[model samples]
Target chain A: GAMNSSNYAELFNNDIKLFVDDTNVYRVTVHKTFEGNVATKAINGCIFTLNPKTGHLFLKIIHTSVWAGQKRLSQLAKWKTAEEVSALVRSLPKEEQPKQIIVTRKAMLDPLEVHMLDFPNIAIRPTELRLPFSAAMSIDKLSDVVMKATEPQMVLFNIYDDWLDRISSYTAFSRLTLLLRALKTNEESAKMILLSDPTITIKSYHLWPSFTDEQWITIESQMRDLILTEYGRKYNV
Target chain B: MNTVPFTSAPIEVTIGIDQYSFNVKENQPFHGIKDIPIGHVHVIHFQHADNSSMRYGYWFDCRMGNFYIQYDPKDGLYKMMEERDGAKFENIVHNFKERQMMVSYPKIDEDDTWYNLTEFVQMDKIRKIVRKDENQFSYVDSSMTTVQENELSDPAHSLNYTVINFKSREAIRPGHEMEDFLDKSYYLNTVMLQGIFKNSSNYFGELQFAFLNAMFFGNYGSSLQWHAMIELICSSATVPKHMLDKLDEILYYQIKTLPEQYSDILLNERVWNICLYSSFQKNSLHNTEKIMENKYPELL
Candidate 1:
């Protein structure tokens, strides 16, 4: 019970790679990749479909880490279970519970092929970022990056990047337009509404202005350096 | 010594509110002076047949003196008897007519020989008496041996005195026996003194005053150290009358200087919060609210 939504997110961030694909449907995919050799890689995927209109959340777990062992397979299955997925969804106050829950395991996708797909909806895509060799290879470093990406301000900026950019514009007219435009769009107003109340939501999203591509480049570079300092130097491979 | 006939007139014996007067003729024995219940204080007036008289009034207890006059029917004479075990009587009759009353004290060894009044007074005045031999009595006039009779009666003082003296001697001439005795005696004396003062108010000073200041004014003043000093002061047999006269002021100074002396501990916000929480719990929130209101009038 003490494990709130943020704690669950951190827990998921540690053992599994998290990716949000809002292109076709609002979906959260968590997977664990296991490599038997440089030639063969096994990956288990647990996909959570997040659309409220779906009537029931569909948990599709692609068990492909069987060669890794029952331990890793069970760990992947733990998050895939309907009960635990419901528990994680319940911890997220903003996330409404689906009327019903469905757990299904379909055909396994090739791990190497899945890595080629770009998940643009995810704010900080670990797949596109160039992590140091140690960070890219080590599960611990990858988890740290995922956990940092899910940080409050970072997620908020990613969610309302356009609103933040317009609000912080040096042009007074643009700032004025941004404020007045809330009456029509209301997404900015709704964001503020959620931000004002603490009881309505467990996850805190700070009103941090969005970073530019150059700023993100600097941030990502610093993040990789931080990972290098933390794990890379100590565990040089 | 003159050889006088052991003859005395019919003596008048007063046994604490009761008197008995009897006459015994020559070659006649008086048989009725037995089982006379005497009081703690008694007097016997002896009037000799030669028209001479002597009066002896003395105090007697169970251990001090046992005075009785036994008239033997077989001997046909009266013999004055005063039996003592450790102590001696004030009066001793040498002859029946020319009686001399001398304070007698038992000899160190020989029960037959006794010390005279002068020797007895000198020996009693001497603070320390040591037995050098079977019959030899050594009088020590050392400064360390000058323990008062009242202090000797008090076990705490006696033990403390022994420890202090032994430690001083051990400093000069160290011995295992003395060291061991001092070690054991010090521990025993501490335990015994603590027990003795366990229920005494002096053991802990005016704690109510300290508690009042501590609670209301937030003046802790190293309370444990103050209590320890109070204990040290009270543990002694005789404490100075003004020993704790300025204790309150000292405690106030301690409280004042506490923050500067132990800034990390005393000035810690968490420590203060804990203290405030403890006070809140102990006094109850309602009372604590009242106290806070009183302390900060603006809070009202």
Candidate 2:
């Protein structure tokens, strides 16, 4: 009962929709970036598939969100439930039932929302920010923001409006401070941590916890000190 | 239009272990983010031997990134079926300017031929994003005559589908039709959950599925497309967990159980993981981009 299954079950009971199979990932369609003059796409959907081996989480997105761009890498159709696949599998013999299935939404997907996975659409996911604000909505824009960031990459949070003021300040020290402040505040989202290698992990994957009210206050005070010292003129936000 | 970074491997790999390591080059399958080779399509028409079945062939036009209709049996019976049954069906890859190859198969069977559809297109969206691999792109040109008479076989007889593992060089024969490959891709998609967040830190279903759908086009060979589609849908439709595990044997054959005759790519999990990682990661990155194309700064 202490497993992630409980977490997933709770999600479904709450009416949070999730499709956790290989074919049904959500925002991957919009997450595409390419060359030439074509506009870069970013995955706007989410899914929570299970690993056949360890039963870990697997997420999917499209090169672009629209069908026009999505056709290039197509899955037969869309995600169905494990039950739908089971009927077909049962027709075969008992041995063949385990893998080759045409899962109905009833079997795999519904339970995922109820059991182990979380869909970011309903969580404290990311928000758009960066220069040429239009440029920032895409993966290209975000990568640019990353390249320009003191660190090569970082996660952006859904808390915008006021946060954008601090994010685009363009100084290494302020950028770092603003990032730490924001991360600490949105502790849940802060769970969206990064590591250069795959080994240093706890649990299967970590969640960028939502920011806590107390952490927000601490962040505010810290930022206040940073701005007064070296970043007085530039720290207007 | 987006393009793939064909130069995926280190500069040194291009001349060594990985000959095709360079970034995606502009070729036939002018995939929106074009790069990746689609070759000539070998249509294994069950009708290749008999006149009982209709003759229809679609050209995998890697250039325009579409399947061009060629040997369609322009008959009163079939067109009547489409017109009469009246399902507003859609085909994947709708954007290509599909011109009739003009070499249509002559109407032969008012005798009521046998045809089966294993899967149906769910949306007009797939048609719009329809694409061809550069490797099998411009196979058949105008030289072939649609009217030429070639002997065909009955769909009721002979092997429906066969699995030939390119690695071990073994063929897994099936009792029915083949529908296993559709599944190999599931794990391919599953392993990338981390990378998806790594790229964007956000997730949405309709949004991700849209891009996930496109990756199959460039990643899948046409020969495997239809068969894989059948198998793919099988997984999505619903089944029991124990049964799902058993379904994998179908990858090597069409039988309920895999005969020792088949070779499984899963033999080397490390290599399989590499292949899956490369493809899935590339796919995830491609999705992260606003448009997937070469010269796109992110692609570079």
Candidate 3:
């Protein structure tokens, strides 16, 4: 009975321009743990960005905890360290800079053998559930930040109406409130991809950046917690 | 960097176990240093015994230094067919479903000694075993011939490096594209357009959906699995005036082109499990024998 988390969140996809650019890292796709503006009524997942115009897909680790060698998960999972790493490389000579920072690929999804048994068939909890404090379950294929673009994909886009349509309906409007509408466009885009692709054979629903079952379990717990408690009680349990 | 450990053979390194046992056959990896005994099994590629219908195609990556269990349709999953005397044999099919992809083995299959994959799961999961007699723990064997054969038979396993094309559903691009400076066709269509404007002397990357997929739809699956995303990202390229219009065209075509056959049904649902079904009649038994000779090398 559990729903696909990202699907329920505010999804978005840019509809203008010859080529779509993903540049920001903070584009919150779906963070059940995150409340307030972002999680008000969120989507399942997202592609992070560095700038509104352009961004990259990246995970953010906000907190830090360590015991002996055990480090607090996500103490710094965000672009903060990535920024630090980037700055460090920038300081280095030309050859010293890392070849790439933002990699394109899927987050690793490992079978939660141990967790699967422990957290079998999780029912949605009342409050914000703390996702398991393990390393990101997605398989990462990082890409170098697209500092520039080349020949853009030649396709039609709906920049004006798409953006307007999204903003017009959303009440939790922000500088980035365009995501929900964008995702609507994205679903349409995916439909288009299926038509054009010669290799069409199956139906893929989960977005590339989708969370694994473990993530869902944690997300479910968080949701129950969110319902019971107010926002921002993550990891307290 | 470090001595690149290149091999041609499919290395069968066990995990959560010891060194004596092996996981996959030597023919697994297409090419590698043949005769090399894998020292430590970061992973074992095989099938889910409980869900024998599920492919046990997984490997442990040395990079992150973790084991990954991917559904390899190479050999596919083991399904069951009717045997003589109203019994059935195992069959391997490829299907992927949400409920079919449960995390744990159900109690029913667990109780049935027939379903327990102790061989591939328990016994074959050998890593490093220290023989109290030898005193020193065994380091992996780096045989050359074995590795070579592995890499040769399985072109994917042999790949030291190669281009990944998204045209195949089996190919999924690495997630998170955002740091490249070059103007590749598959991604970043706007980073270059940052300054084509008469205003704002400086510009930023114009993010779009189609451009993202075109640029990074690389790694999907092994000749199996379909990505619903392939279509969405494919349509990310276009101007807004007629964006939805074009998207409509693309979506219609993609749905029409879906494959008639997919592994999802067999991979996810236990209905594909051969032993789970009722006894096969005599005709099914005979037909299975025919398939056995024509298809499987290990079935005999």
Mark the regions of model 1 whose C-alpha exceeds 4 Å error after superposition.
Answer: A1-237, B1-206, B209-289, B297-300
Q: Write the per-residue lDDT of candidate 1 for residues A76-128, one digit (tens) a residue.
A: 34323322243444454443433222222211111111221222221222122
Q: How far does residue A100 in candidate 2 sit from its true spot (Å)?
A: 32
For DockQ, the strongest prediction is 3
Residue A148: error of model 3 in Å? 36
Rank by DockQ (best first): 3, 2, 1
Q: For model 1 chain B, where is the 10-residue window of minimal lDDT?
A: B112-121
Please report, as a residue range, the 10-residue window in candidate 1 chain A with the lowest summed lDDT. A129-138
Error of 3 at B202 (Å): 33
Give the TM-score (0 to 1) of chain B in model 3.
0.18
Which window of 10 residues has the lowest lDDT sum in candidate 3 chain B? B201-210
Each model's RMSD to truth, in Å?
33.3, 26.2, 28.4
Tens digit of per-residue lDDT, candidate 2, span B1-300: 111111111111111000111121222232111322333111211112223233222212233332222222343111101111212211222232132211122223452111111011122222222322323321221112211111223222111222213111011112111222222332223322223322111211112222122111111222232233223323332333432333232221221111223213112233323322342222222222222121122222
DockQ of each: 0.01, 0.01, 0.02
Q: Which is the winner by lDDT between candidate 1 and candidate 3?
A: 1
Q: What residue pairs clash in candidate 1, if any at all?
A: none
Write one digit per residue (lDDT tens) for candidate 3, span B1-300. 001111223333321111112334433532111121133222222223233222222222222221112222474431111122211111111111121321111124234221111111111211111112221111121111122234324332221111222222113122222221111223212321222311111110011111111111211221111122222222233323333333333322222222224323212232112311231211222333344334432323
Q: Give the CAPRI rating of model 1.
A: incorrect
Candidate 2 lDDT by residue in tens digits, A48-103: 23222221222222223234444433332232222222223234354422321112
